Design a protein around this ligand. Structure first.
Ligand SMILES: C[As](C)(=O)[O-]
Ligand SMILES: C[As](C)(=O)[O-]
Ligand SMILES: [Zn+2]
Ligand SMILES: [Zn+2]
Lengths: 157, 158
């Protein structure tokens, strides 16, 4: 279930991923939203300015520092790309709520393989393999081509 | 695959885990050792201030990314009292660290929790190589099973 409201936030994730691309980083963007609708924190990949500089992970730590457990449980995380296992686990450790993603890690994995990219050193596990209790929605068919194009800009060869 | 020298570092990890439990934190301890046998960085769990991501293996991955070249990372070993959760195993692999040696597996931990009637963590106890297929992993250490059973029971089995 991805509503029109969820798509709007996913579009903002895509914009953040493009901000990252244009700054020399990798095209991953994410947004943290309170149950009450309000955007709490937005981020993107900052690999240039540690390979662990993932925005979803920054979200998890920001949430643990700024929000009570009750507010974390009720918050939603939107993301352009489905969390890697590092980030899915961090999300569950700090007790955040629903995740909605635009493109799956399986999708990205298949595209990387087409570009002849040597396999990343972390497996593309579905969020629920890592974090079984998290409610996960995605991918968003409307945004597949756009994300393919952003990924091609960074990782195509 | 567990040498005398490896076991000595695992005993240091256990001591770090005990330090953590005595300070109010969870009993997890880890040490980063370079290819010359020199300890570079030691750490322990620090979750009690409210950040459940304050794991020592993740601190080591970030420390290593800041302080070590890619070549030095690849040749360093991470010793740990408990096998890396998926968060920490992924971070380890993303930063390009080398071998991991652990005293107790995640299979041991998960089996003990269910023995004790304790709630499972919200992160699945995936073995390191499910998350990070290329990392060389050694453990667990039979010599340390009873100690770590006792230590995890103290924190998680009440
Ligand atoms: C979707 As990611 C590589 O920022 O965990
Ligand atoms: C063995 As652990 C919970 O510090 O990743
Ligand atoms: Zn990630
Ligand atoms: Zn961990």
């Amino acid at each position: 279930a991805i509503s029109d409201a969820d798509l709007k936030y996913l579009r903002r994730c895509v914009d953040l991923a493009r901000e990252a691309l244009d700054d020399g980083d990798e095209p991953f963007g994410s947004v943290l939203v309170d149950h009450t609708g309000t955007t709490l924190f937005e981020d993107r990949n900052r690999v240039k300015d540690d390979a662990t500089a993932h925005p979803e992970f920054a979200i998890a730590r920001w949430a643990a520092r700024h929000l009570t457990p009750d507010r974390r449980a009720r918050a939603t995380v939107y993301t352009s790309g489905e969390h890697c296992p590092m980030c899915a686990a961090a999300h569950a450790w700090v007790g955040l709520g629903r995740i909605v993603y635009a493109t799956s890690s399986a999708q990205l994995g298949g595209w990387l393989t087409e570009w002849g990219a040597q396999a990343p050193p972390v497996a593309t596990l579905p969020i629920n393999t890592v974090a079984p209790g998290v409610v996960v929605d995605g991918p968003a068919e409307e945004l597949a081509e756009t994300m393919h194009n952003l990924y091609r800009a960074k990782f195509g060869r």
